[PDB]
Amino acid sequence: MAVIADPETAQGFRLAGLEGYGASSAEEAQSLLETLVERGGYALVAVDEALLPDPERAVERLMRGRDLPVLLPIAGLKEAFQGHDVEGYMRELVRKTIGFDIKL
Amino acid sequence: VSPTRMNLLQRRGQLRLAQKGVDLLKKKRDALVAEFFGLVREAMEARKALDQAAKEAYAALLLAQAFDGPEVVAGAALGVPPLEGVEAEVENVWGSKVPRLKATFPDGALLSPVGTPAYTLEASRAFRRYAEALIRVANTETRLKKIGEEIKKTT
Amino acid sequence: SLSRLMNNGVGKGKTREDHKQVSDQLYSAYANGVDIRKLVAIIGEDALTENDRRYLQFADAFERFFINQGQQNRSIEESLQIAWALLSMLPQGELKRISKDHIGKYYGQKLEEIWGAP
Amino acid sequence: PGGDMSEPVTQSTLRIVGAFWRLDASLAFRRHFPAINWNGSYSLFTSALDPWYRENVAEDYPELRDAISELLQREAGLQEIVQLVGPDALQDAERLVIEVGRIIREDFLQQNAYHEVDAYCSMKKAYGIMKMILAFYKEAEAAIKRGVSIDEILQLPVLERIGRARYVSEEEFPAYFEEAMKEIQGAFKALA
Amino acid sequence: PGGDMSEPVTQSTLRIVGAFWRLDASLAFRRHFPAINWNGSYSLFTSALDPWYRENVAEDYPELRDAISELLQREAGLQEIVQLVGPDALQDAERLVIEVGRIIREDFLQQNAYHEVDAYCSMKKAYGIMKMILAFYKEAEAAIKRGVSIDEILQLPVLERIGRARYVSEEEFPAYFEEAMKEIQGAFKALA
């Protein structure tokens, strides 16, 4: 599987066997992500939230054709150690899926 | 449609069929709602476990950078191959088929696995546990999203 | 089906005192069973809980033994015994329509004796 | 006389007849003769004729007839759900019941009155066809319990063997029945 | 006969009557009696009877009645949400109004005619019950906005006073009403 993240953790990704790339702007993140979508290989791409909060919104026209690629957003290296509540992400997820806001 | 008594009986039978179908679809939606709530609780738990594993893996990686040095880590990372134990499978959920991901990365796949750079080996350990939590999160969340779209179709 | 004057006929000093609650419980349980039976064909048996499966099996056994009696003559005691045997398939305390006194007095008889010759 | 079954002639006839074979225009449109409406038809002579069937046809013949009627009723029950959600939402057991009902409708009930062989059918030939269909259904349900998907079951060559058992002649039939039963046993034993 | 309210006799009757107490079977199955559908019923005599109410019962009776009807109206506007998710899953304020509506229904709207004391009730007793329930709801909403004891309110000793007034005598009623008011004050103002 591939993962777009900060350059610091890219060496650790390469050590663990993960395909890591280092980038800091949304433009290159989206272009590289759709390049990973079109290219043959692993179908899973992991995204740091600092570059692209919703990768499905980036590939929404490639997602309408095929739903086999898998995308996963996660906190970046700086956001990881300072931390946050993941339950806000859960509330946003359920509010997106149903269209309804409940169970804070 | 020509008005006859037989046609009237057939239309009333159709009306009863439609009402019974509406009730049955409501019951199905209720069951899907219960499954959705259970799955979203599981997904939240998996997400926070993944966050904790990611934090400690990054801490171990930074310590390995501090001790073993960038060149030794790069020499270790060059030898170790990328993910090759990949398996893709499909799973059924309420009549819909969804894909799942599988990873099997062992110690035998590594190149020079002896941990003389000990902190690099610790980083590899924590990254393996990180990968376990990550694949769990991926599967649970994609199942949750498919359940949500099923509920929308039923509504 | 419906009988308007059933309330006057049954009671104490005539038939048995547990008649009305037994009839009410049988009605409610059979309705739940047939609803679950229609639901299973879509969602499948494994998607059910345990108690919905209990209701489904109660509905099937209720039809097969209570309704399909053939050319036999049953007294009121035999009918009430079969009805109490079928209610024993449901767990005690799920019978919300019956007082606890009659549940203590009558619950627990095995169905299999009636299964031998219903 | 005018349009339909509510005219007084049909209603007056309904109360003094022991059998009532209702025909359907929709089945005759698609050339599915004899086009007897199975849901709106009945008979009252079954119980009286039951002792004769046990002696002259076979001892278990009424049980086979009851099983066939139960299968047709089960198929008629599930068709309401099919209009509601579609055939894809049904589980494998109900899909098997639907397919077996289609098999019965296409093979057993249909009869061509202008064919050279199919115009007449004796009692024992009908009993053999019913036995074959019920044996196939039992084997299919058992294979469903063993984890076989329904789609690969319908690809079996024994399906064509059953569907063309109508056109076998009367005296050629027992050998065909023996061969079909042996093939029915053989096919499902190697599947799982 | 068919349950149609569009039947000619019912439709001709509805054009001339001044009140309309529509019943329904669903409330009868659940044994909530009387089975008056408060969403389908109406009355055209309220406005003219308003001066009599404030001249002989209490000056605040019509506004209290309007508040009760409004709180009943709010509960029916949330049923569509409850038809999607469980009642406990909603917000604590919506849960509060749902529990207040349930209390109002099960306690106030029920009257058994096969009972010695559940078949009759005077005007003053009902007015006191409505006043107590409305005050309890207002104080509970104030406590919810305070931000404490969102579930302890549903276990206060006021629950005995509210349910008890259904069986209080007409002579002992004012003492019960005063004691319930001071109990509400002491429980809501001083517990937390």
From Swiss-Prot, chain A:
Produces ATP from ADP in the presence of a proton gradient across the membrane. GO terms for molecular function: ATP binding; proton-transporting ATP synthase activity, rotational mechanism; proton-transporting ATPase activity, rotational mechanism. The keyword Disulfide bond does not apply. GO terms for biological process: proton motive force-driven plasma membrane ATP synthesis. This is V-type ATP synthase subunit F. Belongs to the V-ATPase F subunit family. The keyword Transport applies. Keywords: ATP synthesis, Hydrogen ion transport, Ion transport, Transport. Gene3D superfamilies: 6.10.140.810, ATPase, V1 complex, subunit F.
Curated annotation (Swiss-Prot), chain B:
GO terms for biological process: proton motive force-driven plasma membrane ATP synthesis. Keywords: ATP synthesis, Hydrogen ion transport, Ion transport, Transport. One of its GO terms (molecular function) is proton-transporting ATP synthase activity, rotational mechanism. It comes from the Bacteria. Belongs to the V-ATPase D subunit family. Produces ATP from ADP in the presence of a proton gradient across the membrane. This is V-type ATP synthase subunit D. It comes from Thermus thermophilus (strain ATCC 27634 / DSM 579 / HB8). The chain holds residues 4 to 158 of 223 of the full protein.
UniProtKB/Swiss-Prot annotation, chain C:
Transmembrane segments: none annotated. Belongs to the ATPase alpha/beta chains family. Produces ATP from ADP in the presence of a proton gradient across the membrane. The V-type beta chain is a regulatory subunit. This is V-type ATP synthase beta chain. The lineage of its organism: Bacteria, Thermotogati, Deinococcota, Deinococci, Thermales. The gene is atpB.
UniProtKB/Swiss-Prot annotation, chains D, E:
Belongs to the ATPase alpha/beta chains family. The chain holds residues 387 to 578 of 578 of the full protein. Disulfide bonds: none annotated. This is V-type ATP synthase alpha chain. Produces ATP from ADP in the presence of a proton gradient across the membrane. The V-type alpha chain is a catalytic subunit. The lineage of its organism: Bacteria, Thermotogati, Deinococcota, Deinococci, Thermales.
